C-alpha cells in the first residue's frame, strides 16, 4: 500500500555476539519501511489519519541505545513487534538493521539483517 | 509499464505540522514515476505520443512552492491528483515526497512517503 | 532470471527536442539490464553460453553517439530493439536512458525513461 | 522471506577471460543476499538460528580470492553453490558480481552479474 | 583571518559564449568564502559584529540568475565586486564559479573558475 | 606542526538567531583540528604524550548540544577557548561549525564560519 | 592569483610500466590548474583575455588518449609542457594526474602524481 | 615539491588503547603523500628517477597490518620513518592516518592524526 521511510536511523548501541563489542559498543543503522493507507491523510491534512514518523524513529532509537541483544536479529524483531502492538493502522513493516563496521577482517561496506512482518 | 522518472527534483517550501515549520521553511525533495505506453514515441520519435518531462516537472514545483500543507502525504496527494487529472495517457504515477531536514532530534538521512495512484 | 547489468554508461550525444541542443549536446546515461540463463555459462567457465558484455556497452555507444534522436524514449526503444535482435538468448532487457543535464529551469537529479522489452 | 545482506565486499583477483587480466588482477566485489526464516533467532537471541554472517563473509573470499575462473558468472554460481550446499537453513540466495574495472574502453561505473538460485 | 562558507550554492542560469547556451540555460554553482574578524561576534554573540549570511547567498543569486554573462568569469567579478561594494567588513573575498555541464564533448565533473580579491 | 582532527562531527542543536530555530533545531556539524607535537606519542606509544581524541569529541559536544547561542560563531569561539584552556599541548586548533539545513530559501550544501586560534 | 579548474577529467589510455597495462588499458583522471589574470576578461566580459577551458580540455585528452607512456609523470610533465607553451598568459599550473584501478594487489581509491610548474 | 599521492589505502588491523580493540580489530585508512622531483621522471618516462608507488603502498600495509601500536600517532610515525630510511629521493612526507570506526559513543565521520617528517 502506500508507505512512510525513515532513511539510515543511526545510533550508538553496545549490541554483539561479543562480549567485546558489548562494552565498546559501534555504529548501527535501520532502514524502516511501514505500510499504510495514507489517501485520507493526504485528502484531509490531518496527521491524525496517518502515524506521526517521529514517534517511529523514537521507537527504534528505544530498541537500539535503550536495550542491548546479542544478535541484529533480535533488534529487528523487537523494532517490528514494537510498531504493530502501537500503531493499528499500520498493516506491514519492513525493518532493516545495519551493522556498518562489525568485528569481520575483510572489506565490505555493511552486514545487514531485514525482515517483514504482519498481523496475524 | 514503461515509465518516466524524474530524480531528486529539490524545492523550498513551507509546509509541516510544527506552526516553526510553516515560517523558516526547509528543503524538500520529490521522487517521480509515471507510467504509460512509450513504445510508439519511440518508434515515431514523436513527443506528441508520450509525456513532456517538462511539464511534469512545473507540476510538481507547484504543489510544493506555491502551496503550504502540514502533511507531506498531501503534497504526494496533490501531486498525484494533479498528474491523474491533467494527464490522459498515465494510467499510474508512484510520487516519493522527501523531508531530509525534518525537526527531529536525532540522527537520520531523511524521512519520506510513498503513494501509488491510477484512475478508478 | 540471471542477469547482466551494465552500471551508469556515459556518453556525451546530440539528442534533443530543441534544435540548440542538437548543436551543442549533452551528457547520456545509460543502466542496462539483460536477462538470459547464466547457469550453463557458470558451472562450464565458456563464454560462449553467455553474452560478452563488451558487446553490449559497443551496442548502447553506437545508438547514443552514432545517432541523434529527437526523443529519448527513442534512444531506449532503439537500444532494447537492437539487443534482442542480436542475441536471442537473451529473452528480455530493461533499458533506462538518462538525461543528467536537461534545459529545465530547476533543481534535480536527472530525468530518466525506462522500458522493458520481450519478443512477442 | 527474512534476509541476510552482505553489502559491497572488495575482493582483489584474477579472473579473466583475457590471460593478461590473469596475472595483474583487479578489483572485485560482491552483493551477498540469502534467504532464510529468522523468527526464531529474533524470539531466541540464540545464534544457532540463524546463519553467523562472518562465515557467508568468509565463503565468499575463498572463491574469489583464492581461486580463478575465467567468467565472473562462475565466480557467482560457485557461491551460490557452495552457500546452498552448507546450510539447510537458507532457501534462496542471490549474488551479483561486479566488476569496477573492466577492460572495456569507455565510461561506466561497473559491469556485473546476478543469480538467483533455490533448490530443484 | 576567520571565515565564512557557503558551499556548492547552485542556480540555473544562462550564461556562455553560444547564443544556444543564451538560449536553454544550465546549471550554476558558487562555492563563496569571505574573510573578516569573527571574534567579537563569537565574543558577544551579536550578529550586528559579523555578516548575515543569508544576505550573502542572496547577493550570489542575483548576479547568478537575475545577469547574465557570457564568461564565468564575470559571474565571479561581478560577486566579488558587490561583495566588497556592501559589506564592507570583509577583508577579502574567494569566488569559485562552477560550470558542471558546459557544451564540451568529453567526460569530466566540471570546470571552474577561482578568484580572490581583496580591499584596495 | 602534527595534527589531530575529528572531521564531520554531527550534533541536533538549537543555536539560531531566529526563536523558530531555538524551538525546532536543527543538525549541527563540525569539523575539529588541533595542532601539538606528536612526534614523542609516536616513538613512546604512549597516549600520555597525546591527547585523547575522544575528550576532544565530547569537549565539542557540549558546546554544541548543551548550550543555545544565536551565532554559529559563539560556538566555534567557545570550542576553541576550551581547547586552549584545558591542553596547554594544544599550540593552535582550527574549529569549523557547519550548518547544513538553514533557513535560507534556495539551494545550497552548507554554510559554516571557520576559525583559527592561538594563545596570545 | 586566479584560477581555471577543470574537474576530475575521465580518459581510458594504455599508460603503464607493465606491458599488460599497454594491452588491456584503464581508467585515468586529470585535475587542471592553471594560473593567470581574469579581472579583464572579468570587466570587460571578452574571452580574449582569458584562456578557452575547452581547448584546455582538449590538450589533456591529446596527452592522455592520444599518446601511451610508461609513467603518469611522463603525462603530467607533458600536459604542463603544453600549456606553458601555448598560453603566455598562463604564468603557473598544477596537474595532477590519476590512476583509480593500477595493477596493486590491495584496497584504496587511486594513485596519483602531481606537479607544478610556472614561467621563466 | 612534485607530490606522488596514495589516496585512501584501506586495511584490517588491531591498533588501539582499549584490549577491546586488540581482539576485535577495526578498520584503518592511510592517506600518503610524498615529494621529490619527477622532472627528471617525466622527461625519460624512466621509472628508476621516481619512486614505484607500488612499494610505498606495501610499507604502508607493513605498518597497518602486520604491527600494532596502542596510538594511531605510532602508526603514522613509522610509515614516516621507513620512508625516510628507505628512499634518499623522497625530500618530505605526509601521512595521515584515519580511525574510521573508533569507539566513541557519538556520530561523527572518522579521528585521524597527520604529520609531516623531513630529514633534520
Ligand atoms: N546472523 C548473525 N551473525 C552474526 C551476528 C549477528 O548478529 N547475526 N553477530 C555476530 C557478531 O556480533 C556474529 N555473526
Ligand atoms: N506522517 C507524517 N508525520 C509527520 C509529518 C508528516 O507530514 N507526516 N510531519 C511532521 C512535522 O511536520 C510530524 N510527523
Ligand atoms: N518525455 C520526453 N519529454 C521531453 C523530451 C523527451 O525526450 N522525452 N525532450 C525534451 C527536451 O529535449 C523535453 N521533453
Ligand atoms: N558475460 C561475460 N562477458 C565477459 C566477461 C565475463 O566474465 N562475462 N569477461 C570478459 C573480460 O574478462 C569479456 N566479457
Ligand atoms: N575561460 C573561459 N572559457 C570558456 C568560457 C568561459 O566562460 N570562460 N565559456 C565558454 C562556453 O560558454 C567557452 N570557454
Ligand atoms: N554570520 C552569521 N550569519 C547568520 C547567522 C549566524 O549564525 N552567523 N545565523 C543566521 C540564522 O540564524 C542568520 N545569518
Ligand atoms: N611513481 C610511479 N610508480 C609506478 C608507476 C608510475 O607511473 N609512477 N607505474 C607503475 C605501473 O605502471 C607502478 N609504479
Ligand atoms: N590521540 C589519540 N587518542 C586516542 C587514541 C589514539 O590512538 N590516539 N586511541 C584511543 C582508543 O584506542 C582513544 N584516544
Given at each position: 500500500?502506500?508507505?512512510?521511510?525513515?532513511?539510515?536511523?543511526?545510533?550508538?548501541?553496545?549490541?554483539g555476539?561479543?562480549?567485546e563489542e558489548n562494552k565498546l559498543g559501534q555504529?548501527?543503522?535501520?532502514?524502516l519501511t511501514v505500510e499504510l493507507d495514507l489517501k485520507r491523510a493526504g485528502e484531509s491534512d490531518d496527521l491524525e489519519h496517518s502515524v506521526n514518523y517521529?514517534?517511529?524513529?523514537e521507537?527504534?532509537?528505544?530498541?537500539?541505545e535503550d536495550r542491548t541483544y546479542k544478535?541484529?536479529?533480535?533488534?529487528a524483531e523487537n523494532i517490528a513487534t514494537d510498531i504493530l502492538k502501537q500503531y493499528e493502522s499500520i498493516s506491514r513493516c519492513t525493518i532493516k538493521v545495519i551493522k556498518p563496521?562489525?568485528?569481520?577482517?575483510?572489506?565490505?561496506?555493511?552486514?545487514?539483517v531485514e525482515?517483514?512482518?504482519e498481523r496475524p
Open positions: 500500500m502506500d508507505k512512510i521511510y525513515i532513511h539510515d536511523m543511526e545510533f550508538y548501541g553496545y549490541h555476539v561479543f562480549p555504529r548501527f543503522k535501520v532502514d517521529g514517534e517511529l524513529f521507537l527504534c532509537r528505544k530498541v537500539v544478535l541484529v536479529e533480535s533488534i563496521d562489525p568485528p569481520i577482517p575483510g572489506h565490505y561496506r555493511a552486514v545487514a525482515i517483514t512482518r
